[PDB]
Paper text:
[name] maintains centriole engagement for accurate centrosome biogenesis. Both purified [name] and Cep57S undergo LLPS, driven by at least three interacting regions, including NTD, LMN motif, and CTD.
To obtain atomic structure information on [name], we determined a crystal structure of the Cep57C at 2.10 Å resolution in the space group of P6422. The ordered residues span from 354 to 428, with Helix 1 comprising residues 356 to 387, and Helix 2 comprising residues 391 to 427. Cep57C is also a dimer in 150 mM salt based on the analysis of SEC-MALS (size exclusion chromatography coupled with multiangle light scattering). To test whether dimerization is important for LLPS, we performed structure–function analyses by replacing F371 and F376 with Ala in Cep57C and Cep57S, referred to as Cep57C-FF and Cep57S-FF. SEC-MALS data showed that the size of Cep57C-FF mutant decreased to ~17 kDa, indicating it is a mixed population of dimer and monomer.
Author numbering:
A (entry chain A), B (entry chain A): 32 to 106
Write the structure that this text describes.
């Protein structure tokens, strides 16, 4: 329904990805909290930090793409 | 493609909702950090805590519905 639709799909895919990662992040953090042992805690903390960095970068992409799209919606 | 599909759609809708809320949560938290003024900070902190509670409850729903679904996938 337009060329703009391809950009809308990219923004949606980005949000869909951000959501998956945030759910994964909530699951890992709860596991970390509930864990009485050191070895697993420390491995999950490292997966968690990597996820935090990917989520930050994903969110920056969403904001730029939306921002770009709204500025195009003005013209 | 089945009666199970209605349950799959509910789980997807739940994840789609969880993702929206988590993006909203990341945007609010960044605003809070960047804010040099008290009044707005304090209003956003309260929206943020409410979002945290809704996200927790949403995630519990996803885990129970998935858990239920996997236990059904065994039989």
């Amino acid at each position: 329904n337009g060329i703009n639709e391809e950009l809308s799909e990219v923004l949606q895919t980005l949000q869909d990805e951000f959501g998956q990662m945030s759910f994964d992040h909530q699951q890992l953090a709860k596991l970390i909290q509930e864990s009485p042992t050191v070895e697993l805690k420390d491995k999950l903390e490292c997966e968690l930090e990597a996820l935090v960095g990917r989520m930050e970068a994903k969110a920056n992409q969403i904001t730029k793409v939306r921002k770009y799209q709204a500025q195009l919606e003005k013209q």
